[PDB]
TrEMBL record:
It comes from the Eukaryota. This is Uncharacterized protein. The chain holds residues 78 to 439 of 439 of the full protein. Disulfide bonds join 127-202, 262-268. It comes from Chaetomium thermophilum (strain DSM 1495 / CBS 144.50 / IMI 039719). GO terms for biological process: carbohydrate metabolic process.
Length: 362
């Protein structure tokens, strides 16, 4: 009764009608630049899963303009190399998807440049590995920057020419992530690592458990399996996803609705408004991998059911439509942060996360 393809296209059109800036080939310049890359990922993935190409022209426009040297980080020399390794990671993975959609080697080359760039801040001398997120300061090895990097080298191991060096890098990277301690006692991932003032050893800093730090790692473990056929990577990804699905861990509501930790206090900032959809998309990649690796028809049924349960809740309770005019005949759908709570406002990060859930069900 619910077409995930029709509703994704409607949410994409709502994203464009309210937040796309033709003058700047970017969505919402008042919102973080990296969230435009998350948005590009969702539009690229919609097209990759629905066989459609309606936004291909728009996507290429964004790519060409955001390719250029960033005004706030000229030293990066463009090609999405920014002042933060996670900012670069989001665009790099969007280019892996651009390559998956079009087959154009140009986008794969961007991802290779981005990996070499991010690897510049991998050090074995602190925490025994991992990279920093703050390229200027180098004081925080967190979860998202390392998850993004891990999925980049894992992705290149399946696509890039010198796959071997990327497979060795991805295997050594997952090993570091596993032993870092960021995966806690319930198989969830806190925000990052803290470092001992005296001993220099690193530990889980017990900062909040964000939804997207439970998703990007799933995509990485999926790609790590497609490059090794070692189902052990899938089982690790299933442990993380299963913990997100358990309501005892606080991320899944009693209704079965994914709930960001900030939604209760209504303090979800521009970053946190987009987290959920990144997880959903990555969970759909896990569910797809689990069902293909096993003959059981029920393989990945829980992950599919979860995405379906969350999509109907976001549709019924979180949706709003745009008012068409005699001048603007633009149509689509708008969405708020709470996939169960009421629609009050729509922001571009909230919109990108909604698109991600619909695309996760295509
Ligand atoms: O005491 C509160 C928490 O303190 C530690 O958490 C921090 C942060 O996790 C981490 O983020 C880097 C941080 O650097 C600046 O000093 C700070 O001003 C901020 O802008 C920036 O995000 O810094 C260190 C490294 O993890 C760490 O001290 C936890 O260890 C824990 O004690 C508490 O949860």
């Amino acid at each position: 009764s619910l077409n995930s393809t029709g509703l994704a296209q409607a949410a994409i059109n709502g994203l464009n009608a309210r937040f796309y800036e033709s003058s700047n080939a970017r969505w919402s310049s008042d919102e973080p630049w990296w969230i435009s890359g998350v948005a590009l990922t969702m539009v690229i993935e919609y097209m990759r899963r629905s066989g459609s190409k309606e936004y291909l022209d728009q996507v290429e426009d964004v790519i060409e303009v955001q390719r250029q040297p960033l005004s706030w980080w000229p030293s990066g020399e463009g090609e999405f190399r920014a002042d933060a390794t996670d900012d670069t990671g989001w665009w790099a993975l969007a280019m892996v998807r651009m390559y998956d959609l079009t087959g154009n080697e140009d986008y794969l080359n961007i991802s290779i440049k981005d990996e070499a760039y991010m690897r510049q801040w991998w050090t074995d001398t602190e925490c025994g590995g991992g990279l920093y997120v703050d390229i200027q300061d180098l004081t925080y090895k967190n979860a998202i920057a390392n998850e993004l990097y891990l999925k980049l080298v894992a992705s290149l191991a399946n696509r890039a020419p010198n796959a071997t060096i990327y497979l060795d890098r991805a295997q050594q990277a997952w090993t570091w992530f596993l032993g870092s301690g960021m995966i806690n006692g319930v198989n969830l991932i806190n925000d990052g690592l803290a470092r001992d003032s005296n001993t220099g050893s690193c530990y889980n800093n017990r900062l909040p458990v964000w939804t997207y730090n439970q998703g990007v790692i799933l995509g990485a473990l999926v790609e790590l399996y497609h490059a090794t056929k070692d189902e052990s990577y899938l089982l690790s990804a299933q442990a993380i996803a299963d913990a997100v699905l358990s309501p005892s861990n606080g991320l899944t509501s009693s209704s079965g609705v994914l709930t960001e930790t900030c939604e209760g206090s209504d303090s979800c900032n521009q970053d946190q408004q987009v987290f959920k959809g990144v997880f959903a998309l990555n969970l759909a990649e896990l569910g797809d991998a689990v069902a293909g690796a096993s003959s059981d028809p029920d393989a990945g049924q829980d992950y599919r059911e979860y995405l379906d349960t969350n999509m109907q809740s976001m549709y019924a309770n979180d949706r709003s439509e745009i008012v068409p005019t005699l001048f603007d005949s633009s149509t689509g759908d708008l969405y708020d942060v709470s996939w169960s709570g009421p629609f009050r406002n729509a922001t571009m990060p909230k919109q990108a996360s909604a698109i991600g859930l619909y695309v996760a069900n295509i």
